Design a protein around this ligand. Structure first.
Ligand SMILES: NC(=O)c1nn(CC(=O)N2[C@@H]3C[C@@H]3C[C@H]2C(=O)Nc2cccc(Br)n2)c2ccccc12
Length: 230
């Protein structure tokens, strides 16, 4: 997160760190007792390592009573995702067992009605992504509030030049932004999960290159089928 501040510890009990051999790769969001939602490109580099999900965390390194690193039984990238596109950029991770819930670990309700979040709406994004252009990794969870950017502006030649389909949404990126390592994390509006940070490479913090987030409501059939597949 660029331009953000350190989050209140455990104030976002849905927040997940998706890891490869104990290193943070991507954000994620606990959406059911046994399932974490993230972005499909997050496991690009994962084949020879172990994917895990850290729940209950504020610091990535320090001991906290609510922190628990779960193994992943199954990783289910969206079947229409492709390397080289950011369409269908969703991933569902089935934890080894149901997560232990409490005040610091709780699923986030997610948007099931397929209608646009209205523009200018202030949404929360949190993550352990990079905090400066040099690539510095924070140890603890950061967040920022970002206004939703209307799709027509996001589609202008100056911005993303018609790449923003109905299944994606944008947020402003003027200094305050999501960035590398925030990929897969949640964009929350009115206490409901609305978007998942995409996981393609991009500039961060440049107003003409808005952040792009996959609209969960657009994928409700897919999420529901996977979630039921246990
Ligand atoms: N939404 C964006 O702005 C964005 N998304 N990605 C993808 C990304 O982020 N990752 C891809 C999915 C894997 C793992 C992961 C990664 O490298 N993780 C990583 C690498 C170094 C430091 C930290 Br923290 N996380 C970017 C890459 C470059 C610049 C901006 C971004």
């Amino acid at each position: 997160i660029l331009g953000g501040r350190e989050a209140e510890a455990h104030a976002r009990p849905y927040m997940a760190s998706v890891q490869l051999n104990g290193a943070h790769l991507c954000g994620g969001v606990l959406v059911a007792e046994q399932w974490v939602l993230s972005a499909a490109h997050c496991l690009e580099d994962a084949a020879d390592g172990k994917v895990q999900v850290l729940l209950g965390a504020h610091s990535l390194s320090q001991p906290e009573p609510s922190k628990r690193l779960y193994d992943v039984l199954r990783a289910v990238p969206h079947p229409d995702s492709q390397p080289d596109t950011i369409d269908h950029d969703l991933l569902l991770l089935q934890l080894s067992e149901k997560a232990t819930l409490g005040p610091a670990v709780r699923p986030l309700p997610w948007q099931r009605v397929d209608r646009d979040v209205a523009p200018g709406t202030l949404c929360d994004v949190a993550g352990w992504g990079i905090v400066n252009h040099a690539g510095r990794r924070p140890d603890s969870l950061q967040h920022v509030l970002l206004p939703v950017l209307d799709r027509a502006t996001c589609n202008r030649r100056t911005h993303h030049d018609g790449a923003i389909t109905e299944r994606l949404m944008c947020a402003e990126s003027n200094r305050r932004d999501s960035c590398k390592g925030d990929s897969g994390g949640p964009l929350v509006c009115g206490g409901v999960l609305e978007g998942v940070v995409t996981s393609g490479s991009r500039v961060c913090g440049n107003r003409k290159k808005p952040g792009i987030y996959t609209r969960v409501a657009s994928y409700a059939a897919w999420i529901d089928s996977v979630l039921a597949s246990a």
